Design a protein around this ligand. Structure first.
Ligand SMILES: Cc1ncc(COP(=O)(O)O)c(CN)c1O
Ligand SMILES: Cc1ncc(COP(=O)(O)O)c(CN)c1O
Lengths: 420, 420
C-alpha cells in the first residue's frame, strides 16, 4: 500500500482531516486511494482488486462503469457537457422519473441530495407559509443548517446559528407517541415533516407501519407537507421507490444518488400546485449553474433504462439476502445478541443489540467489533463502510464470482473477529 | 425552430416555469434547446450554429468541448466515474489550486457554488463564534437561505424564515460610508463579510479601490472573516484570480465554475487554522456523496493546465475588448447615455445610465432595449444573456471567424435596435 500511503501523506495538509468527505477518513488501517472501478470492483492505486459493497454509498446500484451507462455518457460527452440552456436529456429523464414517483407533477433538478432537501424545505415553507420543519433523530438529509440539528432543536454542527436550529423540531424515528405529541404541541406551525422511508445513515433501519401511517395522517390533518427523502430509497426499492414499496404517498419527493447514474445530482418532485412556487414561475427561489447538467441527465436516463430492462432489483435483493443469511448462520451459533436490518439491497449488521428500530438503539451497537470487521473484510478484499452507522449496498454486479468472494469474505471475517 | 418549440411544449408541465434554472426561461422569443456545443459555438436542436457569449454563465472559459479537457475526461471515464473513496485527480487539482489562491492552506471540494458559499459561511460562523453575515446589494452567492436576503435583512425568496434572514446584513456594493456604518453598529457580531470582487449577477460591476480597502481593513480590525466569492472571478481574472488581479487577500476564498472544467463543482479554500474546523477534523460539518467527484476533478485539472499553457487570458481579454470597442463606437455616435463595464473577459452593457458602480444604478438601465438587443443578436446567430443583469463572457475560442461574427453581430444588432 505504498502508493496509498504516499497519497495519504500528501493530503494531510491539503484537506481538513485529509479527505473531502468525513466517512472516507475512517477506512482502516488508513484510507486506500482508488485508481479505477469496474463492475463489482474497485482497484486501489497499488493495484489491488476489492469487491465493493459500498457502491459510493448508494448511487452505483448498477455497479461501476456499467456498459450501457458508459456508452450513453460517451455519446453525451461528444455533444459537449455544459450549455447553460435547455437540453434534450433533462426532458426525457424528467418524464421517466415523474411517471414513477409523481405522475402529472413537476420536478426540479439540482446538484446534490443536500441541495435537494434544502430546496424541498424552502418549498414546503413557501407553500404553507410556516417556518418549522420536523425531522427525526438518526435521519440524515445533507449538509445544510436546517437539518444539522438535534433535540435539545440545537445545532449538531458548529457555525449553525441557534436561531436557525430552533426552527427544526426533532423526535425519535419510529416513535409514534413522540410524533403525536410534537404535532399536538407545534403542529399548526410545521411547514413540513422530512423523513427517510428507510434510514440509511444510522445503519439501516426499516420503518414501522404505524410510524408510516402516523406520518401521512398527521401531515394531512395538520396542513404540513410530507417530504419523503428518497435520496437513497428512490429507484433502489424498486422503480416506484418507497412510495410504491410501502404503499405510501409523499407531498414532496426528494431524489438523488441513483437518478444521476453516478454523476452529481439531486431532485425535488411534487404536485404542480406545490412545485409551481419555484422560480421562475413562483417566488420560492432556486437556481443553479449546473442544474440539469447534460452529463448527469444522460447518465441518469441510461441508468433508469437499465433498471427497467435488466434484472437489477432481483439480483441486488438476492445478493443482500445471501450476505444476510451467511452472517446470520455464523452469528446465530454464537448466541451473542445481534440484529441485521435489511430492506431489499440496503442492510447493516448491529452487534450487541437484539433490536434496532431507532437511532438510539443503533448507537448502542458494538462499534469496536464493527470496525474490526470492516478492517478484516478489507484485508480479505471486500469493502464495507468503515462506520457502523453507514449502510451496506448491493447491486447488479454482485452475482457469480463477485458474490462468492463477498459471502466467503463475510463468513471468514466474522469468524476471525469472533475468535479474537 | 420546430424542434425547440416541441420541447418547449413538453417542458411546460414538467418543470416550474418550464426550465431548471430561472435565467433559461428568458431567452427570446422562447428558449431554444441545445443539441451540442463545440468551440465557440452552441448548436440548436433544429441545427443552427450560434456564437456563444454566455459560456454557460462562466465555467467555459476554454469554450465548448476543449480538446485537452475532452481527452482528460475520456481517460477519467474509462476509470469509472464515482468511488466514494479518495482518488488521485482531487489531490493534483487541490495542489494546483492552492498554489495560486492560498499557498500552504487547505481546500474542500463541493458540488456547486451554492454549496461552496454556504459552507464558507458556516465555517466563518464556526471560527468566529458569531452569527451575522454581511453581504452587498446586487451580489449573488447562490440558492441558499442566508444569501437570499435584502436590506429591510428580509427574505428575497418565499420559504425563507424571517428569523434566518435577519442574521444577514445588507449594504450597497462600493458604498464605503454604508460599509463603515454597518461595522460601527454591528461589527462585533459579524462572522464574515462575503463579496464578489467583481459583480457578475447585476450586470458586471467593477470594485472601487476604496471599497476593497475598507473591506480588508474593517474585516481585519473587527475579527470578521473576509469571504471572497470568486466563483466567477476565480481563474478568470488570471491564475491568481481577484486576489492577484486587485492585490487583495481574503480569509476564505470561494471557488467554482471554471475549476470544474464544466462539471458540477464548488470549493472553499483558506488557511489551515480556519479550514481545520471542517469535519472530520473539526466540528463545522460538511459532507457530500459527490464531493471531489472523479470526473469534475479530472476536468478541472485539465482545464487549469490549459489556462497555464494556452493563451486563454490574452485571447479572452482581446475578445471582450473588441466587443466593447465595437459597441462603444456605435453608441458614442448616438449621444445617448450608456456605460459598458468590463474587467478582462467579463462585461455588460447598460443603456440609459452613464455610470454603474452599484446594483441600484444597474437596475435603472433600460431593460427593454437590452431584451431587444438579446433577441436581435440571437436572430443574427450570437447568444448573449437574456437578462441585462447577467454578464457577457468571452473565452479561448472567441478569435478569428467566431469573433468576427460576434463583433459584426453586435454592431448590426445595436444599429437595428437603435433604428427601431
Ligand atoms: C437520505 C439522504 N439525504 C441526503 C443525502 C446527502 O446527499 P448529498 O451528499 O449528495 O448532498 C444523503 C447522502 N448521505 C442521504 O442518504
Ligand atoms: C459569485 C457566484 N456565487 C455563487 C453562484 C452560484 O453557483 P451555483 O449555481 O453552482 O450554485 C454563482 C453563479 N451565478 C456566482 O456567480
Amino acid at each position: 500500500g505504498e502508493k496509498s500511503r504516499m497519497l495519504f501523506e500528501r493530503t494531510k495538509e491539503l484537506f481538513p482531516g485529509g479527505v473531502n468527505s468525513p466517512v472516507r477518513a475512517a477506512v482502516k488501517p488508513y484510507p486506500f486511494y482508488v485508481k479505477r472501478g469496474e463492475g463489482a470492483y474497485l482497484y486501489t492505486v497499488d493495484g489491488a482488486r476489492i469487491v465493493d459493497l459500498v457502491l459510493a454509498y448508494g448511487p452505483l446500484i448498477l455497479g461501476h462503469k456499467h456498459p450501457r451507462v458508459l456508452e450513453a455518457v460517451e455519446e453525451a460527452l461528444a455533444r459537449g457537457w455544459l450549455y447553460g440552456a435547455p437540453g434534450e436529456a433533462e426532458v426525457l429523464l424528467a418524464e421517466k422519473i415523474l411517471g414513477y414517483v409523481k405522475r402529472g407533477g413537476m420536478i426540479r433538478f439540482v446538484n446534490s441530495g443536500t441541495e435537494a432537501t434544502m430546496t424541498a424545505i424552502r418549498l414546503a415553507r413557501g407553500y404553507t407559509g410556516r417556518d418549522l420543519i420536523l425531522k427525526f433523530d438518526g435521519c440524515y438529509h445533507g449538509s445544510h443548517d436546517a437539518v444539522l440539528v438535534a433535540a435539545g432543536g440545537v445545532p449538531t454542527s458548529a457555525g449553525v446559528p441557534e436561531a436557525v436550529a430552533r426552527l427544526t423540531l426533532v423526535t425519535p424515528y419510529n416513535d409514534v407517541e413522540a410524533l403525536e405529541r410534537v404535532f399536538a404541541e407545534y403542529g399548526d406551525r410545521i411547514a413540513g415533516v422530512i423523513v427517510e422511508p428507510v434510514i440509511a445513515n444510522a445503519g439501516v433501519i426499516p420503518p414501522r407501519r404505524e410510524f408510516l401511517a402516523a406520518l401521512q395522517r398527521l401531515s394531512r390533518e395538520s396542513g404540513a407537507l410530507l417530504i419523503l427523502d428518497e435520496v437513497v430509497t428512490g429507484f433502489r426499492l424498486g422503480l416506484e421507490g418507497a412510495q410504491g414499496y410501502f404503499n405510501i404517498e409523499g407531498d414532496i419527493i426528494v431524489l438523488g444518488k441513483i437518478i444521476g447514474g453516478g454523476f452529481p445530482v439531486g431532485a425535488v418532485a411534487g404536485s404542480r400546485e406545490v412545485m409551481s412556487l419555484l422560480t421562475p414561475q413562483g417566488k420560492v427561489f432556486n437556481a443553479g449553474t449546473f442544474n440539469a447538467h447534460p452529463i448527469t441527465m444522460a447518465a441518469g436516463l441510461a441508468t433508469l433504462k437499465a433498471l427497467e430492462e435488466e434484472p437489477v432489483y432481483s439480483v441486488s435483493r438476492e445478493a443482500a439476502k445471501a450476505l444476510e443469511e451467511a452472517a446470520s448462520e455464523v452469528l446465530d451459533r454464537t448466541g451473542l445478541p445481534y440484529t441485521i436490518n435489511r430492506v431489499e439491497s440496503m442492510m447493516q449488521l448491529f452487534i450487541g443489540v437484539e433490536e434496532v428500530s431507532n437511532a438510539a438503539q443503533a448507537r448502542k451497537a458494538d462499534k469496536k467489533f464493527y470496525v474490526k470487521l470492516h478492517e478484516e473484510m478489507l484485508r480479505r478484499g471486500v469493502f464495507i463502510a468503515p462506520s457502523n452507522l453507514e449502510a451496506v449496498f448491493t447491486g447488479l454486479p454482485h452475482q457469480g464470482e463477485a458474490l462468492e468472494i463477498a459471502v466467503e469474505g463475510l463468513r471468514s471475517s466474522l469468524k476471525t473477529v469472533l475468535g479474537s
